[PDB]
Every structure is written in C-alpha cells, then in structure tokens.
Ligand binder design. Structure first.
Ligand code: CA
Length: 230
C-alpha cells in the first residue's frame, strides 16, 4: 500500500512547505498560495532567500519574458550554492516549468540549510541530530522517538517536546489517547505562546497511516529554534 498515499504525502508536503515559506515571507508582508506554482517566476523564491539569507539579490520583480523568470532563478540558484548547498539536479527550467518533485526538493534543501543545518556534526546528518535531539528531550516521557513519521502521529511527542522546555505552557496530565486533541494542543500552544504558525494540518496527520517525514521535521525544526540556550 504505497501509491495512493505517496500521492497523499506529496499534497501534504506541498501544504507544509508552502506554510513554511509563508512563515518567512510574512516577516515582510509577503505571502503565496502554492509552492508548486508560485516559484515559477522566481520572484517569491528570491524574496524568501533575501529574508532567510540576509542579502539583497536583485531579481526582476514582474517578469514578462520567460527569459526574465529563468534569469531570476539563475540569481536564486547562484546564491543558494554560495551558501554551501549541493543542488542535485535542479536547474532553472525545472522550477519555471513548475515541476513538483524538483521544487519540493529545492525547498527541502533550504529547510535543511537554513533551519536544520546547526544539528549536523561531522558524520551526523542534520536529520540524525534532530531525532537524537528529540530522543534526549523525551527520555522522561512514555514515548518512543524512533522516526519522524509514526512516532509523531499520536501527538504525545509534540507535547513532550514543549512540556520538557516550558511546562507552564502545557499540562502533561491532559495528554491522552486522542491524537487530534494532543495535536491541536501542541500546535495551538506553539502558535500562541512560541510564535510558530501551524505548518502541519492536523487532518493530514490524523488521516494518513503515517505522516510525511519531511513535513514533521519542518515543524520540529521550528521547535528547535524556539529553544536555544544561548
Ligand atoms: Ca485540512
């Protein structure tokens, strides 16, 4: 049983990555509907990189020629590899033409670079550090953190992550066997008391046999920032 739910994970990852883009685009009054269509001219990708890159690359803000959109992504793809990112096989025509697997692949490289990179340690993938991070925060709690898919489905781990850091924000006696209740618990606390938009749609977690791994990691990257000892 994979083919229909692989299509479902793609829908979900589009929504989560879109909402993750908007999180940064909102810091300047910008917003997009759909990451698979809204980077096709390069403007909002250049926009996003300026915010999270702390640079002013000059893009053509209302491209009327296909040439200008393509050149927009030239400047975008240039800057990304200036920040030590390996672009597997993504060129500008792949995003101007609106390819979904390569655009999601691009955005995931930005999430990995600008949201999770701090957790890679010379032989530890950024994914490895993040999970080991959660695992050590969740030792006190009756939860297993083995992955970023099934371990996060029922909501207890999102609550432990917040509770271990800020127990005034969340009561551990109120988490139970109702996944939707726990998920709404954590996402409404993080959204009101930590500054984190609801990048995960509760429907998309409760509904599927397990969540999209890269979506969950993106929300978890956001929790990781909000808890910085320094
Ligand atoms: Ca929904």
């Amino acid at each position: 049983a994979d083919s229909e739910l692989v299509a479902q994970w793609e829908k979900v990852q589009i929504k989560t990555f879109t909402k993750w883009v908007n999180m940064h685009l909102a810091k300047k009054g910008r917003k997009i509907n759909d990451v698979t269509t809204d980077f096709k001219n390069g403007v909002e990708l250049c926009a996003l990189l300026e915010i999270i890159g702390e640079t002013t690359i000059k893009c053509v803000t209302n491209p009327k020629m296909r040439i200008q959109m393509t050149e927009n992504l030239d400047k975008a793809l240039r800057f990304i590899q200036s920040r030590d990112v390996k672009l597997t096989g993504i060129g500008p025509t792949d995003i101007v033409d609106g390819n979904v697997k390569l655009t999601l692949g691009l955005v995931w490289t930005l999430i990995l670079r600008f949201a999770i990179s701090e957790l890679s340690a010379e032989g530890l993938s950024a994914k490895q550090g993040l999970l080991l991070w959660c695992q050590k925060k969740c030792e006190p709690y009756p939860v297993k953190v083995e992955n970023f898919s099934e371990s996060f489905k029922d909501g207890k781990v999102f609550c432990a992550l917040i509770h271990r850091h800020r127990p005034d924000l969340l009561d551990w006696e109120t988490v139970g066997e109702d996944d939707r209740a726990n998920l709404e618990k954590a996402f409404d606390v993080a959204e009101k008391e930590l500054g984190i938009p609801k990048l995960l749609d509760v429907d998309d977690i409760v509904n599927m046999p397990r969540p999209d791994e890269r979506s969950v990691m993106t929300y978890v990257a956001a929790l990781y920032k909000v808890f910085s000892s320094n």
